[PDB]
């Protein structure tokens, strides 16, 4: 193919069901109904026309650029939209249900691969997954249709609410004696001019009570009987709902008004809630019916592991496409290890060293482990390694991991071929036990051949019924202590547990139940390489008291592979994890899916159900999976999971396709500049840019679609004049849409997004997630350090969107608005003068307060997380006075950090003084930092959990648990609070 | 005889750094640190056993040391020497291993000059490898997309070859009828169209061949880039290990220099 756009008219060769072929000239925009009709009109000029049936009997098939033999059932599609590999169409008679095939094509477009590639998969586990997971789809679709239309409105437009109604007193103190003033709008004319109705209401009113006050204030002069008034209230309560002016957020559930995030922000930011009164039948009118059709693929002697009286043994045969310089490195060998998560269950064993030119070992490897002692989550981790010396030095060539038990509980037997994976960039370790289990699908990859023992029959892991028996069989064979348990409970997830502490915890495993959050430390104390201790641990886990979600999430990382542990953790989430905090931790919950041994597990069924019943999290569930589909190590799991989602998410697939299509023409457009058209400068890039965006097929695709950063934001028409390509980083696009909302003027009329391509963005998602987290806990603890976690979404391989904040500048841009003072030196007071000029009068002290508070927060966050490379062009400040950082490419000081704070900030903090650090304003600023820093330390567990769940992500900043040690130093977790303050205080003074 | 002189005591190095000093090492390799608490008197013994790094707390209570409440050692040195000659099963029968292998702790303008050279060498060989890795992935992208394009050719060619076999089928009985009717014109129309079909199909197999050849030659460059990356990875760790000990050696007498060297 290799054609960016098809010419105006092209000649497509049409293959008829007789022998004939017809070259048919047809317009690029021509539809298949047009093509077919004109074809069968042209076909009369060719021989054997008698054999042709009426065109109604046939459809077109052709090959796509994805190599798919696609049946073009949907004949309303356009020739240029077919993704044809070559311009030809084969006339054939349709076979198979039309709706499945038209749906499969739009699913394949959304997930990015032809669904038929799943049909052609040998693995039984793949076919079992896409068959068995359909029950999670049906019960999610049945659930959302129970109480239609309201239940369907709750699915597509779920309440955006905080986790609890109780306002933090810091926020409640802004209310007018516990009341809030709101303005309610009505569109009262065909020309659509609006009427106001301002109310003052108790902050905890539910939306229906707000409707009752609106009608009370409107009827105050109607002299209505108390009974007749209630008839008006009952009517409007049952006939209208409230909407946020400017975006698609609706108050459909009877939560207190103050815990709707839009309005708790208006209380925080002292703004005026603007709500539109809307007929709920007009809302339901924009929710077309959808149905979950069950797909076509939903149709159509052993012995125990504990009776194999032998030690483990695995054979390494040979390897194929190994890429080594025969004359540079001496020999190669296969390294192996038996692992349970990250813990090796026994010492590692290598094959002999063999010449490069003959990767032949034919070795049985013996492991120091009695087969019955194998834990269910046990797995084999291997790699081909090279050696050279003159010290001896090793380094790996490729790796691969294998589950010793498959998804059916059976123990692997017989020969097995395993195509290995490239070693990840910047990994020297010989094995990669945190990588995925699986074989590399790519061709000409080094294939390592193995063999497992065959014990005369298929071996199965024992049933839990037998395990609890052995537990009862094995078990038959105070004040200072409970302070020990409480003390060990306090320590963070990555604390050092000594051998004395381990078997102390295990010795008191029955008294640990009184302190349920001790479970992670206790599970790490188990001898997982012993059938006995594991059997007893299953019995404890079976009746273990549930723990808070943010501690259960720990048990889903790579240190806790056992399916009983993970099952307990998932049951904690699906009972305690609110949809709010689920949506907030979704990035980590999607990542730890990678650690899962098998496709069908309790976590993925949890995430899928909640994703098919809450379209707010289902949206980001899709993009977090879609953004990673390029990676072949996880392409299959996420692909099948995306299939099950797009097959049941309902009418929202139509909107996801518009987003995917729009993002596609943005990456294709940006690729042409950043990779091909590199010779040309900015001004010639601009005139080039607009000509692309003048095209109708581009405008039609980049206008009228939902924002991936927040689907409640509609992106209408483009303001081409405001669009531009920025002069920074890898030349990102600045895009601007009109907000088509009926009342856009009350929120924002310009929606501006930055589209960047070339550098990894999921460092930013994590740090921006973290920043939002530590902002939320400061507010709840009485610190009003306003942070700015602007929106950011990775949509593909080093490509994504960034929410730009209005009325903001870099401090570099502000220094350029002032003058010079020292020789070739900007005036350090320029920043303060700029805040004075934009906050004249009584709003001056406020801006300096907002600057000092927001500054304090970002100083603590950057120091803790190790964000380096902080300079004047990635530090920004609003006209408001709020300060925030951008471009979080690094963290954990990934350089092969100081406490940043420049004179320009000090002269704002000190309101322009000369003895900056000796002012009372600066000593107040230090107090903010010391309090903020300490507050993070007392929540350090959930921050370390958030990082440890992302270890398999592929972000080079954190490849191993040792990389998370940077945050244990900045927070000084192995010391006392009083040693931490001194450490933090010194890190601040050491910068002065 | 004093702890400060013992080869296997390393002071306040980090847990993360004994992990790097014990990786892929044999059972019985051991160090002793100051506890991560960095509080006076406390130490932690770390020994390898079963491919893992076991942490043993060394308790201190009134000038004597030990792992358990019977602290029966006047010094940390004699505590370590006892278990250097007796199995730790004497303390915990699970740990049937003795301290077999202590990790020893040694193995001005001119060193600043040599640190600068090895660092320059390391940095530019780090750029050497970072360049091949982007060429390795850039070549990987182009290969798997050329592979799908070849499977696209396969599908079109399969669809066209069945078009030939349906032409040769449904045309046979009509050609045979035309020839005995003496209608050469109607036969030439069928051959004119058959030959055009047979010409386009051969144009497509030629485009497949030209890509098969373009791919097979690029998939070999791909393997060769892997060859010479695997040749740089070991030399790159070597260059790193020398600069690290040079920078530490120079940290003992020239902090002012490294502050300006690089």
Tab-separated table of C-alpha atoms in Angstrom, chain A residues 168 180 498 543 686 723 811 814 827 831 894 962:
chain	number	residue	atom	x	y	z
A	168	UNK	CA	-13.434	18.291	55.722
A	180	UNK	CA	-24.182	27.272	49.414
A	498	UNK	CA	14.979	-10.268	59.437
A	543	UNK	CA	-10.824	-16.877	57.162
A	686	UNK	CA	2.655	26.107	9.748
A	723	UNK	CA	-3.955	25.736	16.413
A	811	UNK	CA	8.695	31.759	34.701
A	814	UNK	CA	7.729	36.049	32.660
A	827	UNK	CA	15.753	41.039	37.078
A	831	UNK	CA	8.184	37.632	38.805
A	894	UNK	CA	17.265	8.729	37.077
A	962	UNK	CA	15.735	-1.350	44.557
